[PDB]
Write a protein that binds this ligand. Sequence first.
Ligand SMILES: Nc1nc2c(ncn2[C@@H]2O[C@H](COP(=O)(O)OP(=O)(O)O)[C@@H](O)[C@H]2O)c(=O)[nH]1
Ligand SMILES: [Mg+2]
Length: 161
Amino acid sequence: MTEYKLVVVGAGGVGKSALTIQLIQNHFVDEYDPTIEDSYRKQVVIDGETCLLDILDTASAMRDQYMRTGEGFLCVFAINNTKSFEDIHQYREQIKRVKDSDDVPMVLVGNKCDLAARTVESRQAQDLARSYGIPYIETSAKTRQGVEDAFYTLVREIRQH
Ligand SMILES: Nc1nc2c(ncn2[C@@H]2O[C@H](COP(=O)(O)OP(=O)(O)O)[C@@H](O)[C@H]2O)c(=O)[nH]1
Ligand SMILES: [Mg+2]
C-alpha cells in the first residue's frame, strides 16, 4: 500500500493533537499534554487506494526528519485565536525554507468551528489560502466536522504534486 507522510503544524493550543486523535480514535480529547510530539499511523482507503498515513503531531530529531521527509503539511489555526491565524505566515515560511520551494502540498485548517466565538472570518482564511495556492478547510476536533476532509484533502494535494 501507499504511505503518505503528513505533518501537523501550528501554534500551541489550536487543536493539532485533538485533530490527530479525532482522526485516529474517533474521540475528542479535552486535555492532551501540550508537550507530547509523536507520530501516529492509520490505515485507510482513500479514493479506492489503501493508504498508510504516517502523521507527525508537532508540539528534536524526529521533527527535523518529518519536516525534511514530510510530503504534506496541515497548517492549523483556531477560528477563535487571532494570534494563531497571524502566526500561520511563520509556519508557511518555515515549510518553504525546509523544502526550498513555494509549491509544497499543504492545507490551511481553521479548527474549533464548533465554538461561537469566532474572531477569524472564513473569508479572511480563504483569502490567505488563496494567496498561498492551497485549500482552506474548517474543522472541529470536538464534533469531527471537516476532520476527514482536511486529512484526505491533504492526501489528494500530495497526489497532484
Ligand atoms: N471546542 C473545541 N475545543 C477544541 C477543539 N480542538 C481542540 N480543542 C481544545 O483546545 C485545547 C488545545 O487542544 P490541543 O489538541 O491540545 O492543541 P495543540 O496544542 O495544538 O496540540 C484543548 O483544551 C482541546 O480540548 C475543537 O475543535 N473544538
Ligand atoms: Mg498537542
